[PDB]
């Protein structure tokens, strides 16, 4: 079975920070799952004091494809809970800075956490032997160390850079790390000779686009801002922040030529009278107004690349290696590998059969084949032939 | 004469970042000054492309007490300019991150900068021997190293934490460092036995208040946000940021009990629907609505302390040592020393006679006496008697 690690520590002030993934795995479960989480995930449902959370909004639930769980849905699974006493102790060891504590959680081993994880996993006979893989929504060396000791893999699974409603939902699934420490570039370098894609970058974009593209004033430079306390601005940012990204761009452009888009999820917006502030209804319309795009490691950087815009990527991220290739054909081949083999159809990373498939480490050809089968499900070979044919069927339907 | 160091490097994207201090020293000058700066400070006046800067707004000029300089005003002084080629090289050595480059400038020696400074100071005979002291608006180990070699002191001078129109204008003057690395606590520990002030914290506040206090709904916790790229959020913050300060407070209070005030100077404001956002006309009205106040190292933390509010200070700053005393009488005595001896009447830090006075390192009693003489100028002893009498004359006039 699966062992799904969803830490309860409220590093950013919100209880059950990864609730949506708990609900998604519960809703998709065709077998019993082991959940390694906190009591907050179990007690938020009934609380009826948190019920205004976005995870309970039927529009969010529809976009992500889940329904709230019932006593019946939850009874099928096993739950291990981590205590908060360790969280308070963790904060005490990082000058009571919750964000620095989160950084340590993401990037360093925490031996006291490893001990509690080991204890929980040993709390009942047979729990460990029935674990086929761990799953984590973020990097966590503590868990990854525990997994080595036990001989288990760790799939790092997260929502991907292309999301509904603009795009088909995608997910990350990476055995080495998610956002930071990823294996996308390594996987591509191993199979790059198998990719001969007869499509442009914009064609790859159009395959994943689920809406009519927005209507076509240009700004020399577009600046993508991110959520200030998302893990990849804490740990994988190469020290850059929204404010230093802005300063970076100002070294190269006068303010009249800068267009800044705040992240709709950020707690902060921009003051109305310094820069030109983007007000597009989505990030695609924003980047279409820009001649070149600057980002730390936002998902929007991938959108910029795929629409052919000169993009600067200052942080670490899964897609950066696409942008570091010289040839136009090489960039397309890398993008095609990224989109059809590295990224996973979102629902499949919650499907136990697909997860067991990936746990066998199959060939890139088989992975691409299973993804295209899912993407083609409602439609009326080698690897390139599969991708080329898939693009062509969208070409005329 | 004075040697006034005003670096031209646009770490935050703005040319001549310390223009106001250039104009203030020029306007107040009763003798020839040596300016160590950049061409941008000399070429911004006529540029008439920057003229919308706040340094040119007559209301700002009045608040800070200066007028724009003329060809005549500037002719009296000597100017050494630093080249930009070093700035571009500096950026190249810190991953092209201007904010990290600014951090290095503030906190580390930069040997190539020391060489250019030495070269400029040697560029004309007799320049060095006529320097009585350096002045810098910020910490700069490069300059401070040069000064040691040459046998010169470095006065660190900056606008203070109490400013017009709410308060009498104050300034910092610190031989060791401004904001970070300050000598306020050290100076107080040396003279603490001389302070026996028969006044409350609120009385000290009222002495510096220049307006009728705002009219008296309370929030359990007020959160002071700062300018995201001010030096003391870059270098003296103990790694805290606005966003981690907010997370810190959320570990202790639910959002309904938090009141957040953005810095009017910040480029960012808060989204309207997460926290309760303060909209007070000034920071005093904001802290009056709060039962306890949280800050990294804002000037507003001093206001909170002086109005008697429980204050948490997470970064390094000049006033923190006041907040770390236990006794109510000890806190008043430290505050009185801070306000009357450490802080300087703003205009005096631009007055060459006062600067030569301080360069003699006089006793705390003489310093307090000169400050009270300035504050008392428009009014119709030992150290405590001077401060007590000064407070009492405000008591009835
Ligand atoms: N400045 C920004 C950053 C992100 N976003 C939206 O958020 C999604 C995820 O972006 P991050 O990877 O930046 O969190 C993007 O696909 C886009 O839809 C935006 O619309 N404007
Ligand atoms: N959150 C904040 C921070 C500062 N301020 C104003 O800015 C001045 C300087 O504050 P900093 O030291 O935070 O830059 C304060 O005296 C206050 O007048 C404010 O009004 N609200
Ligand atoms: O919340 C985070 O830690 C982050 C993780 C990223 O993978 C990404 O999901 C990001 C969201 O896009 C922010 O809205 O948040
Ligand atoms: O601009 C900065 O680097 C800072 C320095 C601090 O001393 C303080 O002056 C602060 C201003 O109050 C920000 O408005 O800016
Ligand atoms: Cl799909
Ligand atoms: Cl005064
Ligand atoms: Na499509
Ligand atoms: Na007064």
Author numbering:
A (entry chain A), B (entry chain A): 1 to 216, 219 to 382, 390 to 406
Excerpt from the paper describing this PDB structure:
WbbB, a lipopolysaccharide O-antigen synthesis enzyme from Raoultella terrigena, contains an N-terminal glycosyltransferase domain with a highly modified architecture that adds a terminal β-Kdo (3-deoxy-d-manno-oct-2-ulosonic acid) residue to the O-antigen saccharide, with retention of stereochemistry. WbbB’s two C-terminal GT domains produce a polymer with a [4)-α-Rhap-(1→3)-β-GlcpNAc-(1→] repeat unit, while the N-terminal domain of the protein contains a GT99 retaining β-Kdo transferase, referred to here as WbbBGT99. Kdo addition blocks further polymerization while creating the epitope recognized by the carbohydrate-binding module of the cognate ABC transporter, allowing export prior to ligation to lipid A-core in the periplasm. The evidence presented above strongly argues that WbbBGT99 is a retaining glycosyltransferase that uses a double-displacement mechanism analogous to that used by retaining glycoside hydrolases.
We generated a WbbBGT99-D232C variant; this protein was completely labelled when expressed in BL21(DE3), but even protein expressed in ClearColiTM exhibited ~35% labelling suggesting that additional unidentified enzyme(s) with appreciable arabinose-5-phosphate isomerase activity remains active in this strain. No detectable product was found in the activity assay, implying that Cys232 cannot transfer Kdo to the acceptor. We next determined the structure of both the WbbBGT99-D232N (at 1.9 Å) and WbbBGT99-D232C (at 1.95 Å) variants as Kdo adducts. The WbbBGT99-D232C-Kdo adduct was generated by crystallizing a protein that had been spontaneously modified by the CMP-β-Kdo present during expression in E. coli BL21(DE3). In this structure, Kdo is at full occupancy, has ADPs similar to those of surrounding residues, and electron density quality comparable to that of fully buried amino acids. For both variants, clear additional density was present that could readily be modelled as an α-Kdo with an unambiguous linkage to the anomeric carbon. The Asn- and Cys- Kdo adduct structures refine with α-Kdo in a very similar position, with only small shifts (0.29 Å r.m.s.d. for Kdo compared to 0.24 Å for the protein), with the largest shifts in the anomeric carbon (0.6 Å) and carboxylate residue. The carboxylate group interacts with Arg12, as well as Ser233; in the WbbBGT99-D232N–Kdo structure, the hydrogen bond is to Ser233 N, while a ~30° rotation of the carboxylate group reorients this oxygen in the WbbBGT99-D232C–Kdo structure to instead hydrogen bond with the Ser233 Oγ. The most striking feature of the adduct structure is the dramatic reorganization of the Kdo group relative to the CMP-β-Kdo complex, with the C1 carboxylate moved furthest away from the leaving group phosphate, the exocyclic O8 group closest, and the anomeric carbon shifted 6.1 Å from the leaving group phosphate oxygen.
